[PDB]
C-alpha cells in the first residue's frame, strides 16, 4: 500500500466541486449531436440583446402593457422632464426585470457600459428634439434641463431615424459594482428632457409614446454566482 495522508475537506460535499466520478451507465452510446440553430455559449450573448424597459411602471401600469409606454406630448413650456431612473440595473424596479436585469440577478458583481435605445412612436407628421442625459453620482440628481446637460448627453432629433442610442459609459471608482443597491457603489442618474417641445400639424395626435430598450456593450461582464431573489417556492410542485 502506497502511504497516504488525507487532508481536510475529505468526504466533504461541495456544491461547486468538480471531480471525475464513476458512470452508472457504461459504454452508453449517446445519440449523435445535431445542429440546432441559435446556440448560446455565454449568458452575455443574452444581455447584449435589447429588451423593452418598463419605464412607466407607474400607478398600476405594471399590470398593463402601458408600463413600457413613455408619455410625450406638446407642452406650453420648455425643459419639462420626461422621465428619470437611477443607473442601478440590478435592483431597480425599472431595470432589474429586463433581459439584462434578469441575468444580473443571478450574480453579485458587474462592470460595463450600457445602451439605452429610444424609439419614437408618434405620427410621421410629428416632430421634436429631446435631450437624453446621464449624470454620474456625486452631486444630487439633475432637476433642470440645465444641470442634466452639464453631464454626459446626446441631443436626439426625431427625423426619419426614429431610434436614438444613448450610451451610458462605465465610470466608477472601482472596477465592478455590487448588483445590490449599495451607496458605496452608487451608479448615477439617467434623465430625459424636452429640448424643443413636440410640434404637430392640425388633425395629428399631440401625445405620442416612446419605447426604451436596455442592453450591455462589448465591454460588459459579471462575477459571483448566486440564486435569483425572483423565484420562490413553498412545497414541491405537482
Amino acid at each position: 500500500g502506497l502511504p497516504t495522508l488525507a487532508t481536510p475537506g475529505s468526504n466533504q460535499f461541495l456544491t461547486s466541486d468538480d471531480f471525475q466520478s464513476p458512470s452508472a451507465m457504461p459504454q452508453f452510446d449517446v445519440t449523435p449531436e445535431m445542429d440546432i440553430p441559435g446556440q448560446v455559449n455565454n449568458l452575455m450573448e443574452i444581455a447584449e440583446v435589447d429588451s423593452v424597459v418598463p419605464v412607466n411602471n407607474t400607478e398600476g401600469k405594471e399590470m398593463s402593457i402601458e408600463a413600457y409606454q413613455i408619455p410625450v406630448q406638446s407642452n406650453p413650456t420648455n425643459g419639462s422632464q420626461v422621465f428619470g431612473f437611477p443607473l442601478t440595473p440590478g435592483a431597480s424596479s425599472v431595470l432589474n426585470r429586463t433581459l439584462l436585469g434578469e441575468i444580473l440577478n443571478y450574480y453579485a458583481h458587474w462592470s460595463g457600459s450600457i445602451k439605452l435605445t429610444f424609439m419614437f412612436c408618434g405620427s410621421a407628421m410629428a416632430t421634436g428634439k429631446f435631450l437624453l442625459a446621464y449624470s454620474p453620482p456625486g452631486a444630487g440628481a439633475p432637476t433642470t434641463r440645465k444641470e442634466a446637460m452639464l453631464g454626459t448627453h446626446v441631443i436626439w432629433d426625431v427625423g426619419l431615424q426614429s431610434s436614438c442610442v444613448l450610451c451610458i459609459p462605465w465610470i466608477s471608482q472601482t472596477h465592478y459594482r455590487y448588483v445590490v443597491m449599495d451607496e458605496y457603489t452608487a451608479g448615477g442618474y439617467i434623465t430625459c428632457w424636452y429640448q424643443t417641445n413636440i410640434v404637430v400639424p392640425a388633425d395629428a395626435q399631440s401625445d405620442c409614446k416612446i419605447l426604451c430598450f436596455v442592453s450591455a456593450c462589448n465591454d460588459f461582464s459579471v462575477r459571483m454566482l448566486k440564486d435569483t431573489p425572483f423565484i420562490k417556492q413553498d412545497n414541491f410542485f405537482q
Binding site: 441559435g38 398593463s64 408600463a67 405620427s123 395626435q205 419605447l211
Partner: protein, 254 residues
C-alpha cells in the same frame, strides 16, 4: 436607384414587394436548407414538393383597433389548410421546413402606433385554470388568428391570454430574444422574418407539434385624429421553405 426599404421576394408563383422596410431578420443567423444525410434518421426517400409547396400563402386578415391587445398564430398548423402544403402535411408522418414570414400593415403619415412581430419557437402556453390543460381550439385556430387580452382570461379550458405574460408566464417586454422586427407605422410598412427549421429532432409530425408561434402585439396603441381612415388591417403572409416529407401513408390525423 434604391432604398433599404425597397424589396422584392419571389418563391414559386408568388412575389412580395416592400416599399418600406428595415432589413430582413434571418432566424438565428441560420438560413433554412434541406436535411443532410448526416443528420437524418428516417431511411426512406423524402419528397421535396418545391414550387408546389414552398410558396406564399396569405392567411385571413385581422383588424387593428385602439384596444387590440394582440394576436398570435401557431405555425406548423395554420397552413394545415393551404393548398398542397396542407396536403403533403396530411399524408405524411414526418415533415420539416423553414419559413419566410411577412407581416403587412399600413396607415397614413397621420396615423401612429407600433407592433412587435416575433417568432417564438416552442411557445407552450398555460391554461386560464390552474388545474386543467387548455383545449386545442383555444391554442390554435388554423388561419384564424387567436387573441391576447388586456386582462385575465377566464376559467374552464381557455388560455391565460393576458398580454403582459404572452400566455407563457414571462415578461411580454422580453420576447425580443426571439427573431423579430417592429412595425412602427411612422417609419414602417411591413416586417419580414426568415425562420429556419428549429427543433430538437431532424423531423417531426406536423399536426401533433407546433414548433413555433407568431405573435403580433401592439406596444404603441394605434391612434389617429377624427376624419382619418378608421379601419387599419394587418395581414400575415407566410411561405414554406425547403419542405421535406417522410413516411407516406393514408391521410388524416389519428
Amino acid at each position: 436607384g434604391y432604398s433599404d426599404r425597397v424589396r422584392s421576394i419571389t418563391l414559386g408563383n408568388s412575389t412580395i414587394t416592400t416599399q418600406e422596410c428595415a432589413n430582413v431578420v434571418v432566424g438565428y443567423g441560420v438560413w433554412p436548407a434541406y436535411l443532410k444525410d448526416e443528420e437524418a434518421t428516417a431511411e426512406d426517400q423524402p419528397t421535396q414538393p418545391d414550387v408546389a409547396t414552398c410558396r406564399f400563402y396569405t392567411l385571413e386578415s385581422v383588424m387593428w383597433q385602439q384596444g387590440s391587445p394582440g394576436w398570435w398564430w401557431k405555425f406548423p398548423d395554420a397552413l394545415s389548410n393551404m393548398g398542397l402544403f396542407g396536403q403533403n402535411m396530411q399524408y405524411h408522418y414526418l415533415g420539416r421546413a423553414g419559413y419566410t414570414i411577412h407581416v403587412q400593415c399600413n396607415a397614413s403619415k397621420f396615423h401612429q402606433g407600433c407592433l412587435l412581430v416575433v417568432c417564438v419557437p416552442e411557445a407552450e402556453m398555460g391554461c386560464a385554470t390552474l388545474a386543467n390543460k387548455p383545449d386545442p381550439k383555444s391554442l390554435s385556430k388554423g388561419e384564424i388568428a387567436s387573441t391576447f387580452e388586456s386582462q385575465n382570461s377566464t376559467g374552464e379550458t381557455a388560455v391565460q391570454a393576458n398580454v403582459i405574460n404572452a400566455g407563457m408566464g414571462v415578461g411580454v417586454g422580453n420576447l425580443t430574444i426571439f427573431p423579430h422586427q417592429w412595425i412602427n407605422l411612422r417609419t414602417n410598412n411591413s416586417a419580414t422574418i426568415v425562420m429556419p427549421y428549429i427543433n430538437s429532432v431532424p423531423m417531426d409530425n406536423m399536426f401533433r407539434h407546433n414548433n413555433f408561434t407568431l405573435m403580433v402585439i401592439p406596444f404603441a396603441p394605434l391612434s389617429y385624429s377624427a376624419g382619418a381612415t378608421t379601419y387599419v388591417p394587418i395581414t400575415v403572409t407566410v411561405a414554406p421553405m425547403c419542405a421535406e416529407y417522410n413516411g407516406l401513408r393514408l391521410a388524416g390525423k389519428q
